[PDB]
Design an enzyme around this catalytic site. Structure first.
Site, PDB file in Angstrom:
ATOM      1  N   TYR A  51      17.454 -11.850 -63.904  1.00  0.00           N
ATOM      2  CA  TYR A  51      17.208 -11.795 -62.275  1.00  0.00           C
ATOM      3  C   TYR A  51      17.392 -10.435 -61.846  1.00  0.00           C
ATOM      4  O   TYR A  51      18.462 -10.163 -60.827  1.00  0.00           O
ATOM      5  CB  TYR A  51      18.434 -12.812 -61.852  1.00  0.00           C
ATOM      6  CG  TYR A  51      18.514 -14.226 -62.311  1.00  0.00           C
ATOM      7  CD1 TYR A  51      17.163 -14.706 -62.942  1.00  0.00           C
ATOM      8  CD2 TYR A  51      19.531 -14.738 -62.469  1.00  0.00           C
ATOM      9  CE1 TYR A  51      17.294 -15.961 -63.261  1.00  0.00           C
ATOM     10  CE2 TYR A  51      19.524 -16.262 -63.052  1.00  0.00           C
ATOM     11  CZ  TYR A  51      18.398 -16.711 -63.435  1.00  0.00           C
ATOM     12  OH  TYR A  51      18.407 -17.983 -64.114  1.00  0.00           O
TER      13      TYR A  51
ATOM     14  N   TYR B 117      28.828 -23.479 -71.992  1.00  0.00           N
ATOM     15  CA  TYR B 117      28.888 -22.010 -71.463  1.00  0.00           C
ATOM     16  C   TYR B 117      29.469 -22.135 -70.043  1.00  0.00           C
ATOM     17  O   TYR B 117      29.495 -22.738 -69.318  1.00  0.00           O
ATOM     18  CB  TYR B 117      27.239 -21.223 -70.941  1.00  0.00           C
ATOM     19  CG  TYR B 117      26.710 -22.044 -70.014  1.00  0.00           C
ATOM     20  CD1 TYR B 117      26.281 -23.332 -70.238  1.00  0.00           C
ATOM     21  CD2 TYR B 117      26.498 -21.523 -68.837  1.00  0.00           C
ATOM     22  CE1 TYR B 117      25.450 -24.071 -69.333  1.00  0.00           C
ATOM     23  CE2 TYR B 117      25.650 -21.935 -67.852  1.00  0.00           C
ATOM     24  CZ  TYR B 117      25.190 -23.319 -67.852  1.00  0.00           C
ATOM     25  OH  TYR B 117      24.546 -23.780 -66.890  1.00  0.00           O
TER      26      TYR B 117
ATOM     27  N   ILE C 145      17.095 -17.788 -69.600  1.00  0.00           N
ATOM     28  CA  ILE C 145      17.182 -16.441 -69.438  1.00  0.00           C
ATOM     29  C   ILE C 145      17.041 -15.926 -70.927  1.00  0.00           C
ATOM     30  O   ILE C 145      17.763 -16.254 -71.841  1.00  0.00           O
ATOM     31  CB  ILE C 145      18.518 -15.788 -68.837  1.00  0.00           C
ATOM     32  CG1 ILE C 145      18.521 -16.290 -67.577  1.00  0.00           C
ATOM     33  CG2 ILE C 145      18.457 -14.446 -68.821  1.00  0.00           C
ATOM     34  CD1 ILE C 145      19.726 -15.779 -66.712  1.00  0.00           C
TER      35      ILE C 145
ATOM     36  N   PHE D 245      30.845 -18.714 -61.129  1.00  0.00           N
ATOM     37  CA  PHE D 245      29.750 -19.333 -60.425  1.00  0.00           C
ATOM     38  C   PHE D 245      29.230 -20.609 -61.093  1.00  0.00           C
ATOM     39  O   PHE D 245      28.847 -21.299 -60.455  1.00  0.00           O
ATOM     40  CB  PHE D 245      28.380 -18.334 -60.293  1.00  0.00           C
ATOM     41  CG  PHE D 245      27.858 -18.180 -61.463  1.00  0.00           C
ATOM     42  CD1 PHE D 245      27.793 -17.243 -62.517  1.00  0.00           C
ATOM     43  CD2 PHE D 245      26.725 -19.142 -61.844  1.00  0.00           C
ATOM     44  CE1 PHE D 245      27.146 -16.911 -63.402  1.00  0.00           C
ATOM     45  CE2 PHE D 245      25.875 -18.669 -62.641  1.00  0.00           C
ATOM     46  CZ  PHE D 245      26.281 -17.745 -63.840  1.00  0.00           C
ATOM     47  N   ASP D 246      29.309 -20.601 -62.198  1.00  0.00           N
ATOM     48  CA  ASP D 246      29.045 -21.897 -63.180  1.00  0.00           C
ATOM     49  C   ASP D 246      29.826 -22.171 -64.468  1.00  0.00           C
ATOM     50  O   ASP D 246      30.360 -21.334 -64.887  1.00  0.00           O
ATOM     51  CB  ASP D 246      27.380 -21.974 -63.644  1.00  0.00           C
ATOM     52  CG  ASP D 246      27.084 -23.145 -63.999  1.00  0.00           C
ATOM     53  OD1 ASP D 246      26.583 -24.135 -63.224  1.00  0.00           O
ATOM     54  OD2 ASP D 246      26.806 -23.165 -65.459  1.00  0.00           O
TER      55      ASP D 246
ATOM     56  N   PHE E  79      28.865 -14.355 -69.789  1.00  0.00           N
ATOM     57  CA  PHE E  79      28.846 -15.738 -70.431  1.00  0.00           C
ATOM     58  C   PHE E  79      29.925 -15.869 -71.386  1.00  0.00           C
ATOM     59  O   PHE E  79      30.525 -14.953 -72.063  1.00  0.00           O
ATOM     60  CB  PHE E  79      27.623 -15.964 -71.024  1.00  0.00           C
ATOM     61  CG  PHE E  79      26.372 -16.102 -69.904  1.00  0.00           C
ATOM     62  CD1 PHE E  79      25.703 -14.831 -69.355  1.00  0.00           C
ATOM     63  CD2 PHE E  79      26.107 -17.428 -69.264  1.00  0.00           C
ATOM     64  CE1 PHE E  79      24.852 -15.011 -68.376  1.00  0.00           C
ATOM     65  CE2 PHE E  79      24.736 -17.332 -68.401  1.00  0.00           C
ATOM     66  CZ  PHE E  79      24.435 -16.176 -68.039  1.00  0.00           C
TER      67      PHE E  79
END
Lengths: 48, 107
Positions: free
Chosen positions: B82, B26, B56, B36-37, B99
């Site tokens: 979140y 991912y 999540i 961010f990731d 994603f």
């Protein structure tokens, strides 16, 4: 991996390998002068 | 609200069996375009088992909708992921997530 197909102008489109604009790696679709799409989505003015 | 758009086609028949780990890659990024990731940066396939609340809930549901060998772009509603307070220093509050998950292996 990135692969776009499209057209471009002779003057406005000036790819310089490097920073470019946005996140970098600007292709034919990133430039507003040029017009191209990559697979599912089209690219004009550096927005998908 | 999850929208599983198909980045590329994957065998439709295969689907995540309940109570089974899903090996995925991912690359999550924010709505505005900040990344961010990226599991590819970690050079390791992230592993998670379906049916648990570790990941999540929206991500797990999207993986359940996803199929083996198929990549998709899916967006998670901030209330799902979140909502009230985000992950400190990572996701701002009331912000949507995007994603890009590949279900390489199921074993």
């Amino acid at each position: 991996t990135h692969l776009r197909v499209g057209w471009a102008l002779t003057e406005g489109y000036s790819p310089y390998p490097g920073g470019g604009e946005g996140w970098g790696g600007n292709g034919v679709g990133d430039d507003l002068y040029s017009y191209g799409f990559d697979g599912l989505h089209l690219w004009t003015g550096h927005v998908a | 609200g999850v929208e599983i758009e198909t980045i590329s086609p994957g065998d439709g028949r295969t689907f995540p069996k309940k109570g089974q780990t899903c090996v995925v890659h991912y690359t999550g990024m924010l709505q505005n375009g900040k990344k961010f990731d990226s599991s590819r940066d970690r050079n390791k396939p992230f592993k998670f088992r379906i049916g648990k609340q570790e990941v999540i809930k929206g991500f797990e549901e999207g993986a359940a909708q996803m199929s083996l060998g198929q990549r998709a772009k899916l967006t998670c509603t901030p209330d799902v992921a979140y909502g009230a307070t985000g992950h400190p220093g990572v996701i701002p509050p009331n912000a949507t997530l995007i994603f890009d998950v590949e279900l390489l292996n199921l074993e």
